[PDB]
Amino acid sequence: ASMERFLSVYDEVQAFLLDQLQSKYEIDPNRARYLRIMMDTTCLGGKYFRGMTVVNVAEGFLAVTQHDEATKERILHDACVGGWMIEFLQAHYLVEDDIMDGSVMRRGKPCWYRFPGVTTQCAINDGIILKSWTQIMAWHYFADRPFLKDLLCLFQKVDYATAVGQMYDVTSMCDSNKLDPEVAQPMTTDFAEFTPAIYKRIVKYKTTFYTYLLPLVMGLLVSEAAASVEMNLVERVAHLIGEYFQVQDDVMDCFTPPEQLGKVGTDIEDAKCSWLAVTFLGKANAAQVAEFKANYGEKDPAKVAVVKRLYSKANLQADFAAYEAEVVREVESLIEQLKVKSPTFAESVAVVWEKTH
Amino acid sequence: ASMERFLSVYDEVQAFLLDQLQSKYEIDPNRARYLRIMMDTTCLGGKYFRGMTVVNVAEGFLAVTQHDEATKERILHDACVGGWMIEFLQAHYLVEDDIMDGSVMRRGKPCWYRFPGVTTQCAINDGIILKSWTQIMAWHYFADRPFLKDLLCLFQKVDYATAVGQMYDVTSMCDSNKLDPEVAQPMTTDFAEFTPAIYKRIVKYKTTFYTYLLPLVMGLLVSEAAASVEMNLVERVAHLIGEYFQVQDDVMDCFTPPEQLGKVGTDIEDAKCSWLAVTFLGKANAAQVAEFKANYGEKDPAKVAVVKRLYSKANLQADFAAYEAEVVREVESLIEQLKVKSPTFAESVAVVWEKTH
Ligand SMILES: Cc1cccc(NCc2ccccc2)n1
Ligand SMILES: Cc1cccc(NCc2ccccc2)n1
Ligand SMILES: [Zn+2]
Ligand SMILES: [Zn+2]
Ligand SMILES: [Zn+2]
Ligand SMILES: [Zn+2]
Numbered sequence: 286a287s288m289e290r291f292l293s294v295y296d297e298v299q300a301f302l303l304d305q306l307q308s309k310y311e312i313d314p315n316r317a318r319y320l321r322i323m324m325d326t327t328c329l330g331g332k333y334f335r336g337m338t339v340v341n342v343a344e345g346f347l348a349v350t351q352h353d354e355a356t357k358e359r360i361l362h363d364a365c366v367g368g369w370m371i372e373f374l375q376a377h378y379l380v381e382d383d384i385m386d387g388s389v390m391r392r393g394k395p396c397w398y399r400f401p402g403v404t405t406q407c408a409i410n411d412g413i414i415l416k417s418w419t420q421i422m423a424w425h426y427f428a429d430r431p432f433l434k435d436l437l438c439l440f441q442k443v444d445y446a447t448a449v450g451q452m453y454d455v456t457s458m459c460d461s462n463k464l465d466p467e468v469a470q471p472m473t474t475d476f477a478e479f480t481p482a483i484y485k486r487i488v489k490y491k492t493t494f495y496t497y498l499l500p501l502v503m504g505l506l507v508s509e510a511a512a513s514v515e516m517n518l519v520e521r522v523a524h525l526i527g528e529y530f531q532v533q534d535d536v537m538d539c540f541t542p543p544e545q546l547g548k549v550g551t552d553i554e555d556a557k558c559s560w561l562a563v564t565f566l567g568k569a570n571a572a573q574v575a576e577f578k579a580n581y582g583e584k585d586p587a588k589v590a591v592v593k594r595l596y597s598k599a600n601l602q603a604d605f606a607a608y609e610a611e612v613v614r615e616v617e618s619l620i621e622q623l624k625v626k627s628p629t630f631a632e633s634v635a636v637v638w639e640k641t642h
Numbered sequence: 643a644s645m646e647r648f649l650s651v652y653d654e655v656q657a658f659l660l661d662q663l664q665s666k667y668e669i670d671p672n673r674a675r676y677l678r679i680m681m682d683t684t685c686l687g688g689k690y691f692r693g694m695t696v697v698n699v700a701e702g703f704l705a706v707t708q709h710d711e712a713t714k715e716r717i718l719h720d721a722c723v724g725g726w727m728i729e730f731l732q733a734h735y736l737v738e739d740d741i742m743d744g745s746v747m748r749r750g751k752p753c754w755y756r757f758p759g760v761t762t763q764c765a766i767n768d769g770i771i772l773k774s775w776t777q778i779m780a781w782h783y784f785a786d787r788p789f790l791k792d793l794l795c796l797f798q799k800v801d802y803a804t805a806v807g808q809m810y811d812v813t814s815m816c817d818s819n820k821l822d823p824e825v826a827q828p829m830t831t832d833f834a835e836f837t838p839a840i841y842k843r844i845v846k847y848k849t850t851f852y853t854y855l856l857p858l859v860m861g862l863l864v865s866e867a868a869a870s871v872e873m874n875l876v877e878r879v880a881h882l883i884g885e886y887f888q889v890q891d892d893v894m895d896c897f898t899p900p901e902q903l904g905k906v907g908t909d910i911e912d913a914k915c916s917w918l919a920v921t922f923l924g925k926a927n928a929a930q931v932a933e934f935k936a937n938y939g940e941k942d943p944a945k946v947a948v949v950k951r952l953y954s955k956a957n958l959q960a961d962f963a964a965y966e967a968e969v970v971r972e973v974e975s976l977i978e979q980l981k982v983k984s985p986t987f988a989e990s991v992a993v994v995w996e997k998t999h
Contacts, residue, residue, distance in 0.1 A: 310806050311843050315818045320809075322823050381770065385763045401826040406742045409766060410808045413738065417802040424795055437794065438781055445774040449667050451767045452677075461672045466679050469758040486668050 287340050287361075291333060294365035299324055301425065302418055319402075323411050324418075327376040327397055328369075335375060335500045336368025338637055342504020345629045350508075363507040366426045370419040370440065371499055377419075378447060378495070380412035385455065386555070392547035416444070432506040439506065443499045450490025457487055458556035458582060472556050472582050476566060484563045485528060493527025497637065504633070513627045522619040522634055529612045530641050535560040536605060539593060553592045556582025561596055564604045573599070613642075644697050644718075648690060651722035656681055658782065659775055676759075680768050681775075684733040684754055685726075692732060692857045693725025695994055699861020702986045707865075720864040723783045727776040727797065728856055734776075735804060735852070737769035742812065743912070749904035773801070789863040796863065800856045807847025814844055815913035815939060829913050829939050833923060841920045842885060850884025854994065861990070870984045879976040879991055886969045887998050892917040893962060896950060910949045913939025918953055921961045930956070970999075 303321055306312040312320075343364035347357050382388070383396035384405055390396065398408035419440070427433045459470045461478060473479075501519055505511045538550035539561055552559045565577065573595055580591040616638050623631035660678055663669040669677075700721035704714050739745070740753035741762055747753065755765035776797070784790045816827045818835060830836075858876055862868045895907035896918055909916045922934065930952055937948040973995050980988035 306806070310803065310847070312806070313818055315821045316809065316813065319813075319821050319823060326823070381766050385766045400823045402821070402823045406812055407809075409738050409742045410805060410812065413805045414802075414809070417798070417805050420798045421802060424798060434791075441774070441777045441781060445771075445778060446667065448767060448770045448774050449663070449669070452673065452764075452771070455763055455767065456673065456676075461670055464672045464676050464759070466676060466683070466757045466759045490667070 287337065287344060288333070290361060291337060291340055291365050291368060294362065295328070295369060298366065298369055298422055302421060305421070320414070323397070323403075323414075326394075326400075327380055327411070327415060328372055330392060330394065331372075333368070333372060334640060335496060336365075336372045338497075338500035338633075339368035339371065339504045339507065340364045341636060342501060342630070342633045343508050345633045346504075346508040346510050346513075349629050360507060363426065363430070364504060366422055367436070367503045367507050368500070370422055371495065371503065373415050373419045373422070374440075374444060374447075374495060374499075377412050377416035378451070380408060380415060382451065384408055384412070385451075388548070388551075390548040393544075394547075432509065435511070436503065436506050439499070439502055443494045446490050446494040450487060450492065450494070453487045454491050454558075457483075457558035474578065476562075476578065476581075479558050479563050479566050481563060481567070484558055484560065487558060488528050488531040489524055492531050493523055496530065497527045498523040501634070501637070505630070510627075510630070514623070514630055515626055518619055518622050522616065522623070525612060525615055525619065526638055526641050529609070529616075532560040532605070532608065533641075536601075539596060553581065553589050554584050561601060564601055565596055565599050568599060568604070569595070644694065644701060645690070647718060648694060648697055648722050648725060651719065652685070652726060655723065655726055655779055659778060662778070677771070680754070680760075680771075683751075683757075684737055684768070684772060685729055687749060687751065688729075690725070690729060691997060692853060693722075693729045695854075695857035695990075696725035696728065696861045696864065697721045698993060699858060699987070699990045700865050702990045703861075703865040703867050703870075706986050717864060720783065720787070721861060723779055724793070724860045724864050725857070727779055728852065728860065730772050730776045730779070731797075731801060731804075731852060731856075734769050734773035735808070737765060737772060739808065741765055741769070742808075745905070745908075747905040750901075751904075789866065792868070793860065793863050796856070796859055800851045803847050803851040807844060807849065807851070810844045811848050811915075814840075814915035831935065833919075833935065833938075836915050836920050836923050838920060838924070841915055841917065844915060845885050845888040846881055849888050850880055853887065854884045855880040858991070858994070862987070867984075867987070871980070871987055872983055875976055875979050879973065879980070882969060882972055882976065883995055883998050886966070886973075889917040889962070889965065890998075893958075896953060910938065910946050911941050918958060921958055922953055922956050925956060925961070926952070 299321065302324075303312075303317050306317055306320065340361065343360055347360060352360070379391060380397050383391055384398045388396050389399070397403060397411065398405050403411070420437075423433070423437060423440070427436060430436075456464060456470075457478070458472050460473050460475070463470065498520060501523060502511070502516075505514060505519075535552065535557075537546055538552040538557075538559065541550070543549045552561075562577075562581070566574065569577065576591060577595055580588040580595075583589070620631050620634055620638070623634055656678065659681075660669075660674050663674055663677065697718065700717055704717060709717070736748060737754050740748055741755045745753050746756070754760060754768065755762050760768070777794075780790070780794060780797070784793060787793075813821060813827075814835070815829050817830050817832070820827065855877060858880060859868070859873075862871060862876075892909065892914075894903055895909040895914075895916065898907070900906045909918075919934075919938070923931065926934065933948060934952055937945040937952075940946070977988050977991055977995070980991055
């Protein structure tokens, strides 16, 4: 089974990386153990949606393509290594993001940097190692693969788009015209940049490229099946599902219980450009807008309670329903278009959509 | 002239990166301006020793190799782009290191993260962008180059070795047997791991690979001259000069005036495994060792003054002279061995040595 194969490949890749640190990088057992625990704590515990999407895309093509048994095993092995590259890429960004944001918890566990024997000094560098390991993996396992050049080039572009997205996100509550490394940044007072287009730009770069585009395209690359698809449709369907995934995360930050979310939501206190803030500003009257402005982006629990009350009264449950109906139409339309060149890939996209919905 | 060509290529690469963010990444002018200032502040102002070493290696081979004028211009252009990849790699590590260490100044200027409109939240991500740009550069300028695969593989290994070196450095004042993400780390009381071999391991990985090995080997790769050299001699001579460079930096941290160094030295307060600490422990009597242990690794200015007094009394100026004489012998021996296959490359190493000495 796919998940078992995927998890087995983690153990193999970890053993490879730690053995190489011992044989070629002069590491001692206690530092190898620290890095083993760092890898496990930062990479394991999720649903492995991203890595498993690579495997699932590859499995779809194996069911319709003629291959020797050893070739099927090799493609599935490459899809697992590729999937782990994405999981380690996410681990890098979550470690660095939690430090940047001074976050307390990540999926019911303390953030890595908060571990007593870690600290920010080590955690910033541990995050750097996590992304370096993605490349060590690719060069070792894919050294003689025809897709190596395309895989590394795609991975690099996605990594860069993600860092750009993080920049869009951390500066989302600043007035663009005031951005200056020499001047301390005040939070916006007009919220003029809390627009659907600006929200969509943050999400496309910060989340969509690494969460949806990269796993789908990597699955195609390891299967040598990129010519079987229209790349513009893959990008368009990735943009759409990715946006919907973030809208769900934004809604959950404010309304889902902390024990179910895995953290206490701080989007309101952090003055985040969330779907809730953008949608509320898109329908509120002048008095509700003024009340939002006097309470948004402050740690004060009573001020946070006014925002949570304004959202509940705004009936954003109805806007979400209308948004969801529109996404369903467009996702289904793109899935139909994907069937022209690849009914197999279209099914893998339908699975990805079902898992998000 | 080489330096002018190098600096001109910076302007061209910056224009390329910022234009691409506008054309393909949906950036707005104020964020493009922030990134332009970030690039300038973090990448410019040094001596460009690393980047210029690539150019100098390439220039050596151009004087002895038959090429059309356009090919000479292309090789020099590639050597400049390659040199900037190394300068941006260093910029990434200095930005992240200053955050990790809570440093105040870097070469007479405040550390990037301290800029009022930057903060740690942005600076950690800016550092990430600096290293992503190294790859954007390589894929754009070297897309059809025969050396692309070897250049990216080398660059990745060096980047990884550097992150491992940072791990060796930040944990250098911990007892290895006590390293544990679950337990807050006490500083060593025995200083048993302050040995020449352990010091050499920190320096080889944290500094030597990116400062000496990478610029020399990149100069060979852009010149298609790697087969003209014995790679083991290049690594050995890089290890030696790199170690000597760090010993100089360590001595300067304690004895050189802050205005000349470009910062107030904190190695003593930070309990760093410096050449001074290792050499002092290698010759001190039982009473001097006990006095060192009661004063090392504490912010207290009076305690720092005891360590500075112990070093001055230990006559470490004599150990440095004997160390320097030994390095001169071995560096000259390796330069002689390099003359067998490449007198041109041996001269480039002699220049690198002269610039360090
Ligand atoms: C593996 C694991 C999970 C949960 C907690 C834990 N260690 C205690 C801790 C770590 C960081 C901050 C607070 C408490 N370890
Ligand atoms: C470009 C440049 C150089 C020196 C100082 C400066 N800005 C003021 C500042 C920045 C950070 C910390 C303290 C003071 N800008
Ligand atoms: Zn964040
Ligand atoms: Zn969220
Ligand atoms: Zn440091
Ligand atoms: Zn130093």
